[PDB]
């Protein structure tokens, strides 16, 4: 050797990540009596959650009569029927309660004339199960809702005995006989190693938009938690479903909230058309993201792109009252200027679809427990939980509704807190771990620390980011997807020629970024190989060489006298990816989509049907 010192920690439970999901599960546990430990690689308030703008959905009814079941409906239709409706049941029925909790904590929600929480319009959201017109259930704090939401949560956590370990990098899970014994990590401040023996581990580490070259995500969204599970021999789910947000400013890729269109802002091309009226006669600009992005994409490569390169489009806001802009969208107004010199009251905002959110993630049940799939049956992995963007419950399926992640965060983060609280008891004897538990992680660490090859970290990463960006975008195809696989597989191989320079251990971000590359690559492989395998069009996954959505039945005609297709012959099912770490070979399997709700009498399960906005 041990050329590194190891300190073993003993806790009832361990939380990994301090964004929305993380903080809420962490103090939820301590709030329940357990001796919790929160491990994060960033100071809590620096998490990508703090960058969120638009809002968090809840059927409060502060703007009009609402029904949480209509909210449910929206999300199921939204997920092109790939979302587990039981998960979607819980998420949408707990929402009002989740939001009110936030306001009761301190969240400075913008107010109505009645002294209540202000809600705006957002994409793919209606009343009366898709018949009663546009809805207004996106609770918010101007256009800085993520900022406030995280700042409040961190503030709330300062009230319990939760032990935090900030700027600690998590390496892998402490696995023993199919169960999780904790996690191992590197203390970046003083370069030491740490193993946390706990009866329960919760992972909420974010997504991995940084697998691509153009994303809205932060440089710290490197899917670290996703890779840890993989190295455990556990499957990740639906990683091929990548959401491209419609409005990410040109050049910097920074995000421009959907809230803009929700206040009146529209889309316009070179000639000046509001093309969305053409593609989506009703929803127009408030159609689903997956739908909208393809629309933009088309207008461009088709010839009507804007700018000096005819490569982007225009988001117009200036036709709206200056007061409303300064009151609803003050954030983006300050961003436009600093990154495009645009003044939202005088000129349009240059934008184009940008990698933004990951629908796929570590598979769990509606209780936040991590599951595995063996011989056609899901089975919970004792001691492991997941929530946040790093998880796949999966409330979002093949297309996430705007303002549903921030909701998911708080709802499931608490759920992990509740499930554990009802399952285990604080104080229960912590599991033993073999003396050498984790030496291989250290091993890898040391190897990357003194790496001296031909291809430096910054170069490999840039090769990965450019292949995803070319072989797995809004529109995808078999040949192009096939090449991207070859290209990536080669790069993953070339990682053996990696070269690093910093030979220190304290705040060696040269090293850390190399640990993250291994992480991003794993995520990327499963993404592109899963994409190549899925020959159908569903949500954010459009194959021009397979333009139809293949379900077990053809729901374009009456079901009477129809032959239900075999599991093996249709694609209405989650993807299950596995990776041969040492070689980097992808292995896929598939599991069924959960369509039953938590209670049929209370919330009707919703069957497939044509998906149009």
């Amino acid at each position: 050797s041990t050329q590194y010192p190891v300190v073993d920690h003993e806790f009832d439970a361990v939380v990994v990540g301090a964004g929305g999901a993380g903080l809420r599960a962490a103090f939820g546990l301590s709030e329940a009596g357990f001796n919790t430990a929160c491990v994060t690689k960033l100071f809590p308030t620096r998490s990508h959650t703090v960058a969120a703008q638009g809002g968090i959905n809840a059927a409060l009814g502060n703007m009009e009569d609402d029904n949480w079941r209509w909210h449910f409906y929206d999300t199921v239709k939204g997920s092109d029927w790939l979302g587990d409706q039981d998960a979607i049941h819980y998420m949408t029925e707990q929402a009002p309660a989740a939001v009110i909790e936030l306001e009761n904590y301190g969240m400075p929600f913008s107010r109505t004339e009645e002294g209540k929480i202000y809600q705006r319009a957002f994409g793919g959201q209606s009343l009366q199960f898709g018949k009663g017109g546009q809805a207004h259930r996106c609770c918010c704090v101007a256009d800085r809702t993520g900022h406030s939401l995280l700042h409040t949560l961190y503030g709330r956590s300062l009230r319990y005995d939760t032990s935090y370990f900030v700027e600690y990098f998590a390496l892998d899970l402490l696995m023993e006989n199919g169960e999780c014994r904790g996690v191992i990590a590197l203390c970046i401040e003083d370069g030491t190693i740490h193993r946390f023996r706990a009866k329960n581990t919760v992972i909420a580490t974010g997504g991995y938009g940084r697998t691509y070259f153009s994303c809205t995500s932060a440089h710290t969204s490197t899917g670290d938690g996703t890779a840890m599970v993989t190295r455990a021999g556990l499957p990740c789910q639906d990683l091929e479903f990548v959401q491209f947000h419609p409005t990410g400013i040109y050049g910097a890729g920074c995000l421009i909230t959907e809230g803009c269109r929700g206040e009146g802002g529209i889309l316009i091309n070179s000639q000046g058309e509001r093309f969305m009226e053409r593609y989506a006669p009703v929803a127009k600009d408030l159609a689903s993201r997956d739908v909208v992005s393809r629309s933009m994409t088309i207008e461009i490569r088709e010839g009507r792109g804007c700018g000096p390169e005819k490569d982007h489009v225009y988001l117009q806001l200036h036709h709206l009252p200056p007061q409303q802009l300064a009151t609803r969208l003050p954030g983006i107004s300050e961003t436009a200027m600093i990154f495009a010199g645009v003044d939202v009251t005088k000129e349009p905002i240059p934008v184009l679809p940008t990698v933004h959110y990951n629908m796929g993630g570590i598979p769990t049940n509606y209780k936040g427990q991590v599951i595995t799939h063996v011989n056609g049956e899901d089975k919970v992995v004792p001691g492991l939980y997941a929530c946040g963007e790093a998880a796949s419950a999966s409330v979002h399926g093949a297309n996430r509704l705007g303002a549903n992640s921030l909701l998911d965060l708080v709802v499931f983060g608490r759920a992990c807190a509740l499930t554990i609280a009802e399952t285990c008891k604080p104080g229960e004897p912590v599991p033993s771990i073999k003396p050498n538990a984790g030496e291989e992680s250290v091993a890898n660490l040391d190897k990357l620390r003194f790496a001296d090859g031909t291809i430096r970290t910054s170069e490999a990463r840039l090769n990965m980011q450019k292949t995803m960006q070319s072989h797995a975008a809004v529109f995808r195809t078999g040949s192009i997807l096939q090449e991207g696989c070859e290209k990536l597989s080669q790069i993953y191989r070339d990682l053996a020629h990696l070269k690093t320079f910093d030979r220190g251990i304290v705040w060696n971000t040269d090293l850390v970024e190399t640990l993250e590359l291994q992480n991003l690559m794993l995520c990327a492989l499963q993404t592109i190989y899963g994409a190549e395998a899925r020959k159908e069009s569903r949500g954010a996954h459009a194959r021009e060489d397979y333009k139809l959505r293949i379900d077990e039945f053809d729901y374009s005609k009456p079901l009477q006298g129809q032959q239900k297709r075999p599991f093996e012959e249709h694609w209405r099912k989650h993807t299950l990816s596995y990776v041969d770490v040492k070689s980097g070979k992808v292995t896929l399997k598939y599991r069924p989509v959960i369509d039953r709700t938590l209670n049929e009498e209370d919330c009707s399960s919703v069957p497939p049907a044509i998906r149009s906005y």
């Binding site: 319990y160 005995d161 939760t162 032990s163 935090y164």
Partner: protein
């Protein structure tokens, strides 16, 4: 988990015994008019103070009363210029500190805090000082 006080006490405990350097400050920080006028308010205050203290002492210790030292000065037919100057260097600190001193009492009412107002007042203070000095040193 540790308390805020437990963290502060341990913060100094670890860093005061490390080999970590202290990032520079005064030597590398950019100045501004407000910032400079701020230090100057303090300097003139201290000087004004010592001045008044140096006066009470001389009163308790010197041999002659004040009237005699005033004569000892007049029987020196000093260049009125040197006279003027001496009067200017006499009332400049007092002048500055007072106007700027007023500026502070206004701030204490929470008015004039916009950064562009801090500059404006700073400059009005600088012209009132000069004008109210030249005048006195000439009377």
């Amino acid at each position: 988990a540790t308390t805020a006080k437990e963290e502060m006490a341990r913060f100094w405990e670890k860093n005061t015994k490390s080999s970590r350097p202290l990032s520079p400050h005064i030597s590398i920080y950019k100045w501004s008019l407000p910032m400079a006028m701020s230090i100057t308010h303090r300097g003139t205050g201290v000087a004004l103070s010592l001045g008044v203290s140096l006066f009470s002492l001389a009163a308790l210790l010197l041999p002659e009363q004040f009237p005699h030292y005033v004569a000892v000065v007049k029987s020196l037919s000093l260049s009125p210029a040197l006279i003027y100057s001496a009067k200017f260097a006499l009332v400049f600190p007092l002048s500055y500190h007072t106007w700027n001193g007023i500026r502070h009492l206004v701030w204490d009412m929470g008015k004039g805090f916009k950064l562009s107002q801090v500059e404006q007042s700073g400059v009005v203070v600088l012209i009132l000082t000069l004008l109210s000095s030249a005048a006195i040193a000439s009377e």
